[PDB]
Design a protein around this ligand. Structure first.
Ligand code: CDL
Ligand code: UQ
Ligand code: PLX
Ligand code: PLX
Ligand code: PLX
Ligand code: PEE
Ligand code: PEE
Ligand code: PEE
Ligand code: PEE
Ligand code: PEE
Ligand code: DCQ
Ligand code: SF4
Lengths: 156, 71, 98, 105, 175, 318, 115, 83, 70
């Protein structure tokens, strides 16, 4: 159908635009963030993929939880996630963000950031190498490429 | 040459206005055609309204705002 | 007189009435003073341009200069008023009566 | 009240700007130079009380040049009668008053 | 008669004066004064005063900016007022608008002496001079002439500005 | 036909602005021992298009405490003034030929500052307020010295008309006669466009995002467009003012190429300076402009008033 | 005439860009998303509370200094008069007074910000 | 002598900007009164014909007034060509 | 690479090439193939109005030479 072709092409264009321009929030918590700093270092150069850190949550598209989420911090993380305009994505990095990790059985640690916010990609490691985080980011790009919002709307 | 041409053009426009006004204001009982509003009889520089009063809008705009709006 | 002269005179009158009728803040009265200065500038400039009074062309500029002084003066006073009360309200200036 | 220091010392502090017929830059004339010149020459040396009476014609001409009230009244009357005549069709404007004039340099 | 641009500009001038004269929060008063300054600059440009109009507009921007800073510092409230957030401000705004409309309507529909004298209208274009000469600007020449002709004005203005600096520094001392 | 000219001015400036963002990213990357955008399209040529489409397909949100009218108005004012600033510039023929082009440009710049002030105040946030007050301080710092430098430079031109600057610099660039003021002027433009080392209104490392912290998607993109358009405009103005390109009336394309190359060089210099220096403190900026730049500016204004009279080199066209 | 058309075109394009930005994407606004931003937490006080300006004296002086620029703007045109001696004397006098005001404020700690 | 030398050395070492500003300002103030070309600038300004030269009515008693632009009488700008 | 910065820069150059040249062409196209007349003062405007008046077509850029004085 003509409308089917039109919505497919529009979905392709929008997905390409969104995945080719990913702006994660300047937001890190612990050791994992250091590896994130090494992903912006010249050797890997995430900016060459169109990935740019931005401090304002209103101007960010992705949240990379790189570190341990404590009970004292969980409201702040949820607050800065809610203030992100949509569409928005979350990447969980390291053991601490994935499931608590080395501090799983602590009284002051959230046993996984997915109890607070939904998570799209889980990057394992303590800490994951900057190459592993880059692989996770590219996997998120592929996941965005698979999105079919306009087709679903048209088929409604 | 420009001064002479300007003088002739202004006088010609004034005479055209005067003749047309003589045609229009004939029915008015106590209207003098070409009556000055000044006691002095010396030549008074014509106002823009006198020269372009009975003409089209475009000519008035060009005479008034033509130079200021030209960019 | 053209209608533009009437409009500018009415602007000056409106600004004067706004200054003379006081609300709480003082900065609003200072702004009304600035508006009166602006209206005076516009009126004088229109008259001078229409009349082709060449040497009078510098008159509006001088006006603006003293406007600045007036504005500066007012702002200075406002500072002290705030420093005494924490607000620029005019109802705090009632220590002296008639 | 008025200490005329300028006249005593021949200083000319602000008299160069008081009137519109007083040595403008580049000899650029005022719009009503002749009328104001005539009024000033009429009223000179005879005092304000006498000048208000014996120089009223020149002052009236100067005011008419400044504000052009009577000229606007005359033009308004002419235009109103033109509109009245045109509406019922007794008068038609000539081609040179409708934009079809043969222009001249 | 021709496009009545100057009349519309002067009406916006009056509208801005009403806007900042009803005295809302000083932020909106400054906005209204900026609008009025720009529109008056447009009017003066339309009547041939490019430098003066540009200069007044240039002077007001920054003066208002200084005011914006001063309003944020010592002239703020928890809920700043706008022209629709208060009965007094809205009433003053509406009264100013209706008075301007009444003045205009009594002006263009008949010849009546409102305050000073009467007026008929017919656009500003009637009062022009059709002067045809010059490789210069008359306004520029007059403004340029202040140094050569107005030696006294320069002296008094410079003294006033220096004394104004001294005066502001004296006033804001405190103690 | 004039509307076609307006469009032919507006659209290439926007396209140029988008491409400037890509050029800045790559220049910063290569100065930082990395590459910059090279994946989205060949040599990252499609990156600005992806950025724009992503920004304008994202939801813009109105803050609960914001004043909606000023919040919406401020980006419109910023972008409209940024586009308006380009109309009197002669390349070598201006779209609008003004007798006082420099003064109109000065007035327009003053208007641009208000958009930053209005957006910061209407955001109704603490960081936005800090950014707005920093903008106020910056304008107070630079405005007077910028105007006096412009007057001193134009004293050699004879008039405020922009196109006459082409005639004044027929044989030598004006910088050779005013290289001190020029340097000051350059720094002033850095302060004026809120560029590093004077990016105090945004202040990412201090104020998160400054005045545009609450803005998202399209309004934020419009603020970005206005900033980069102002950057290119100011570099073009500096190129016209101090680096006078030769103009052949029968072949204006030569002047166009020369002018564009000079503006590109100055913009790349801006990017270089951003990549080279730390950030000032916003009181240190005012102290620098008032205690160092202003005495020299006054002295050079005196010198440049006296110089044509001393040497009998007063320019024509009173 | 042309300048009004240019300004209208610029404003119209900016407003159309705003309209496209606000009407094309899908909006899901809830109270938590639109809350004020203070990097992790609810703000303590209002952002409309008074914010002390420590450079108020320099701000006031800028008003006077700004006025000085207007006097200086006419200088290029003025440099064309026949009595160049008087014009040069007046220009130097005005600049000297500006420098003197700057020096007076500088020496009496007027350019130093409040503590 | 020594006192002002020490003062100038201290100013040059500590505030060179103010030293340069005062030097340039003093030069701008004092130099034009010593220049021989200022009168040439005044004459160049005087010689620019902004407005029309209105002719005089001949009365038979004007030996120094030319009857034509190309007559030897009247001001000449041979000096301006060689300047 | 460093020369990989050159493509994008070149693109910007092309963009900045468009406005000025465009203006020039349009001015010539609407001005009769010659540069649009500049009227900064009233005398130049009066000259342009005189050319428009004597053109016989109501176009200032239509020039009448010695062939019109018979
Ligand atoms: C004739 C009479 C004059 C007519 C006024 C002009 C038209 C403005 C009316 C619409 C604005 C108000 C809409 C509103 O309340 O919320 C909208 C609506 C309601 O939101 P809400 O959350 O439900 O409730 C909000 C609250 O009620 C309250 O929330 P709030 O904080 O938003 O309310 C404040 C607002 C409310 O306004 C009012 O109270 C009534 C309006 C009267 C304002 C007039 C005051 C005079 C100021 C100076 C004169 C201005 C010129 C006027 C002449 C007009 C002809 C050109 O006041 C304003 O901000 C109005 C300012 C407009 C001036 C724009 C000029 C730009 C300056 C650029 C520099 C100039 C250079 C020199 C030239 O929300 C929206 O639709 C989104 C925002 C849409 C705003 C778009 C931009 C504003 C309109 C453009 C102005 C025209 C410029 C040309
Ligand atoms: C140290 O980290 C940082 C960086 O380094 C990685 C940055 O780059 C950086 C700068 C931000 C970049 C991500 C650049 C972003 C690019 C823009 C926001 C895109 C804007 C471009 C468009 C919206 C312009 C219009 C788009 C059209 C296609 C142009 C034509 C217009 C039509 C109407 C025709 C920042 C702030 C930063 O902090
Ligand atoms: C006109 C002004 C208003 C509209 C503004 C929009 C401007 C026009 C949009 C420009 C379109 C260009 C985008 C196309 C780039 C695609 C690049 C290509 O590589 O995409 C591939 C396939 O393409 C995508 O599947 C779809 C993109 C094509 C979009 C369809 C065309 C629709 C155009 C309709 C235009 C209408 C605009 C709206 C007007 C109202 C997938 O590759 P990718 O995975 O990335 O790269 C892998 C990285 N590796 C190689 C290193 C491993
Ligand atoms: C009686 C006691 C005197 C001393 C104290 C009096 C206090 C008042 C301040 C100064 C007195 C006013 C006198 C100045 C009058 C100005 C006009 C006069 O000087 O002529 C000018 C001569 O110019 C002189 O150079 C004036 C310079 C004197 C003023 C500069 C310094 C003095 C002021 C210092 C005090 C002010 C405040 C303190 C600031 C530090 C212009 O003449 P010229 O241009 O040929 O021809 C004009 C006619 N044209 C246009 C047709 C061609
Ligand atoms: C860059 C320069 C070039 C740009 C050129 C394009 C400019 C376009 C301006 C903006 C329009 C595009 C934005 C998106 C398309 C418009 C659709 C929307 O805005 O209008 C809808 C209109 O809906 C109306 O409320 C009801 C529809 C009926 C309208 C009544 C008008 C009379 C029609 C009756 C039938 C007779 C036909 C007569 C027509 C000739 C409201 O939908 P809404 O959900 O809020 O918005 C969410 C949109 N989402 C879903 C994509 C996120
Ligand atoms: C397409 C449909 C057109 C409908 C127009 C409606 C306009 C409007 O106010 O709507 C509000 C609309 C969307 O809000 P919602 O409806 O709540 O969300 C959309 C999801 N339903 O908000 C906006 O985007 C407002 C946009 C502003 C409109 C333009 C008016 C601005 C004028 C500014 C002039 C001042 C410019 C200053 C510079 C000039 C100085 C020389
Ligand atoms: C906003 C500030 C507006 C500034 C406008 C400046 C325009 C300008 O200066 O161009 C000059 C230009 C040419 O003049 P000269 O340079 O002397 O050359 C003529 C001889 N050939 O002047 C003009 O053409 C004047 C034409 C009209 C002026 C435009 C006035 C617009 C003023 C702003 C009004 C905005 C609309 C009202 C809504 C306000 C917002 C709520
Ligand atoms: C300055 C540079 C950019 C200038 C602006 C031009 C941008 C052009 C972009 C072209 C791509 C088209 C935009 C597609 C994204 C639209 C937003 C969107 O995805 O909405 C999703 C939404 C999902 O809704 P539901 O599934 O029913 O509900 C689920 C939630 N309960 O689906 C839709 O609404 C589809 C709407 C059709 C979009 C029509 C686009 C056509 C082109 C318009 C562009 C305007 C030109 C300017
Ligand atoms: C024969 C008659 C001649 C008349 C005399 C003329 C000769 C003049 C001699 C001196 C001229 C020098 C002018 C310099 C202007 C001011 C310089 C200055 O002193 O400012 C510095 C500061 O200047 C800066 O650091 C600049 C800050 C921002 C720098 C960012 C850019 C750096 C350079 C990039 C390239 C510059 C390109 C310039 C030209 C560009 C092309 C237009 C003061 O800083 P402090 O050391 O802290 O001193 C204060 C305490 N005393
Ligand atoms: C005669 C020409 C005059 C006209 C032209 C002048 C143009 C503009 C220059 C004047 C502007 C105002 C200058 C005011 C100077 C005030 C100095 C001052 O008080 O500041 C001192 C610093 O300056 C001093 O030390 C006092 C003055 C020292 C000498 C300054 C120059 C004086 C004249 C020297 C040059 C003489 C002429 C040049 C000859 C060159 C050799 C041939 C304190 O510095 P802070 O910023 O507070 O320190 C903060 C960090 N801790
Ligand atoms: C643009 C250059 C790379 C930017 C990297 C941004 C990293 C943001 C995380 C914040 C953070 C910072 C700044 C930081 O400095 C730090 O070390 C103590 C952290 O702990 C590991 C952090 O989490
Ligand atoms: S997962 Fe390991 S490296 Fe990452 S924050 Fe936790 S303890 Fe540190």
């Amino acid at each position: 159908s003509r409308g089917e072709y039109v919505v497919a092409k529009l979905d392709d264009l929008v997905n390409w635009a969104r995945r080719s321009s990913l702006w994660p929030m300047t937001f890190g918590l612990a050791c994992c963030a250091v590896e994130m700093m090494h992903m912006a270092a010249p050797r890997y150069d995430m900016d060459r993929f169109g990935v740019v850190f931005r401090a304002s949550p209103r101007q960010s598209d992705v949240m990379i939880v790189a570190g341990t989420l404590t009970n004292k911090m969980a409201p702040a993380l949820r607050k800065v996630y809610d203030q992100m305009p949509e569409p928005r994505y979350v990447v969980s990095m390291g053991s601490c963000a994935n499931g608590g990790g080395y501090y799983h059985y602590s009284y002051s640690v959230v046993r996984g950031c997915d109890r607070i916010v939904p998570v799209d990609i889980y990057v394992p490691g303590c800490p994951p190498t900057a190459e592993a985080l880059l692989y996770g980011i590219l996997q998120l790009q592929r996941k965005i490429k698979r999105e079919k919002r306009l087709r679903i709307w048209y088929r409604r | 040459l420009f001064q002479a041409e300007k003088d002739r053009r202004v006088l010609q426009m004034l005479r055209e206005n005067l003749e047309e006004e003589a045609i229009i204001m004939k029915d008015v009982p106590d209207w003098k055609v070409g009556e000055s509003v000044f006691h002095t009889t010396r030549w008074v520089t014509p106002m823009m309204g006198e020269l372009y009063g009975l003409r089209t809008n475009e000519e008035i705009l060009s005479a008034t705002y033509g130079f200021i709006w030209y960019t | 007189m053209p209608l533009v002269y009437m409009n500018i005179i009415m602007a000056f009158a409106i600004a004067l009435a706004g200054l003379l009728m006081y609300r709480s803040h003082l900065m609003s009265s200072l702004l009304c003073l600035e508006g009166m200065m602006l209206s005076l500038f516009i009126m004088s400039t229109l008259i001078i341009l229409n009349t082709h009074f060449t040497l009078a062309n510098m008159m509006p500029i001088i006006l603006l200069v003293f406007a600045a002084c007036e504005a500066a003066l007012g702002l200075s006073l406002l500072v002290m008023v705030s420093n005494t009360y924490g607000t620029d309200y005019v109802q705090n200036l009632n220590l002296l009566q008639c | 009240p008025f200490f005329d220091v300028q006249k005593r010392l021949g200083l000319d502090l602000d008299r160069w700007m008081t009137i519109q017929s007083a040595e403008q830059p580049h000899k650029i004339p005022g719009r009503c130079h002749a009328f104001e010149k005539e009024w000033i020459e009429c009223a000179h040396g005879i005092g304000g009380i006498r000048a208000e009476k014996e120089c009223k014609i020149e002052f009236d001409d100067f005011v008419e040049c400044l504000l052009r009230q009577k000229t606007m009244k005359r033009l308004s009357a002419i235009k109103r009668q033109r509109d009245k005549l045109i509406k019922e069709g007794k008068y038609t404007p000539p081609p040179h008053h409708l934009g079809k004039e043969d222009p001249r340099p | 008669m021709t496009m009545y641009i100057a009349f519309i500009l002067s009406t916006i001038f009056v509208i801005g004066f009403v806007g900042f004269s009803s005295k809302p929060s000083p932020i909106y008063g400054g906005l209204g004064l900026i609008v009025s300054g720009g529109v008056g600059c447009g009017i003066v440009l339309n009547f041939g005063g490019s430098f003066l109009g540009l200069m007044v507009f240039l002077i007001y921007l920054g003066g208002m900016l200084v005011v914006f800073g001063y309003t944020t510092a010592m002239a703020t409230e928890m809920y700043p007022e706008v022209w629709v957030s208060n009965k007094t401000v809205f009433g003053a705004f509406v009264s100013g608008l209706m008075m301007e409309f009444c003045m205009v309507y009594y002006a263009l529909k008949e010849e009546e002496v409102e305050i000073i004298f009467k007026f008929n209208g017919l656009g500003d274009w009637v009062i022009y001079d059709t002067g045809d000469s010059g490789f210069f600007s008359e306004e520029a020449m007059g403004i340029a002439a202040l140094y050569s002709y107005g030696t006294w004005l320069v002296i008094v203005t410079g003294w006033s500005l220096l004394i104004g600096v001294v005066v502001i520094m004296e006033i804001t001392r405190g103690n | 036909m004039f509307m076609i000219n307006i469009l032919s001015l507006i659209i290439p400036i926007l396209l140029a602005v988008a491409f400037l963002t890509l050029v800045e990213r790559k220049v910063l990357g290569y100065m930082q021992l990395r590459k910059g955008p090279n994946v989205v399209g060949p040599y990252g040529l499609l990156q600005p298009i992806a950025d724009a489409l992503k920004l304008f397909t994202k939801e813009p949100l109105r803050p609960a405490t914001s004043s909606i009218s000023m919040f919406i108005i401020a980006p419109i004012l910023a972008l409209s003034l940024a586009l308006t600033m380009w109309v009197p510039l002669p390349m070598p023929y201006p779209l609008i030929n003004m007798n006082l082009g420099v003064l109109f440009m000065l007035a327009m710049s003053s208007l641009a500052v208000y958009s930053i002030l209005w957006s910061g105040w209407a955001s109704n946030s603490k960081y936005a307020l800090i950014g707005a007050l920093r903008a106020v301080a910056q304008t107070i710092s630079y405005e007077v010295t910028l105007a006096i430098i412009l007057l001193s430079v134009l004293l050699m031109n004879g008039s405020y008309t922009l196109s006459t600057l082409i005639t004044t610099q027929e044989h030598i660039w004006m910088i050779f006669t005013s290289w001190p003021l020029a340097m000051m002027w350059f720094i002033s433009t850095l302060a004026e466009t809120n560029r590093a080392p004077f990016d105090l209104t945004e202040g990412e490392s201090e104020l998160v995002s400054g005045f545009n912290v609450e803005y998202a998607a399209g309004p934020f993109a419009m603020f970005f467009m206005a900033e980069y358009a102002n950057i290119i405009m100011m570099n073009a103005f500096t190129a016209i003012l101090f680096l006078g390109a030769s103009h052949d009336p029968h072949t204006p394309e030569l002047y166009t190429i020369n002018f564009v190359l000079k503006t590109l060089a100055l913009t790349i210099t801006f990017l270089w300076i951003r990549a080279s220096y730390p950030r000032f403190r916003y009181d240190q900026l005012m102290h620098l402009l008032w205690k160092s730049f202003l005495p020299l500016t006054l002295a050079l204004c005196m010198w440049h008033i006296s110089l044509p009279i001393m040497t009998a080199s007063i320019p024509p066209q009173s | 005439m042309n300048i009004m058309l240019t300004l209208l075109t610029n404003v119209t394009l900016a407003s159309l860009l705003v309209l496209i930005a606000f009407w094309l994407p899908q909006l899901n606004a809830y109270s938590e998303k639109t809350s004020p931003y203070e990097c992790g937490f609810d703000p303590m006080g209002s952002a409309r509370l008074p914010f002390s300006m420590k450079f108020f004296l320099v701000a006031i002086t800028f008003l006077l200094f700004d006025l000085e620029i207007a006097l200086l703007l006419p200088l290029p045109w003025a440099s064309q008069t026949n009595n160049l001696k008087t014009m040069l004397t007046m220009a130097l006098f005005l600049l000297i007074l500006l420098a003197a005001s700057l020096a007076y404020e500088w020496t009496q700690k007027g350019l130093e910000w409040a503590e | 002598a020594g006192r002002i030398a020490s003062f100038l050395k201290n100013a040059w070492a500590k505030e060179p900007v103010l030293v340069a500003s005062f030097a340039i300002g003093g030069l701008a103030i004092i130099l034009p009164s010593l220049s021989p070309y200022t009168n040439y600038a005044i004459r160049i300004n005087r010689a620019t014909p902004y407005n029309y030269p209105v002719p005089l009515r001949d009365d038979g008693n004007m030996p120094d007034v030319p009857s034509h632009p190309q007559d030897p009488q009247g001001p000449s700008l041979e000096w301006l060509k060689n300047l | 690479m460093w020369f990989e910065i050159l493509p994008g820069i070149a693109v910007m150059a092309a963009c900045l090439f468009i406005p000025g040249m465009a203006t020039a062409h349009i001015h010539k196209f609407t001005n009769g193939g010659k540069e649009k007349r500049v009227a900064h003062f009233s005398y130049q405007w009066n000259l342009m109005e005189r050319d428009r008046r004597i053109s016989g077509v109501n176009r200032y850029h239509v020039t009448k030479g010695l062939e019109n004085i018979d």
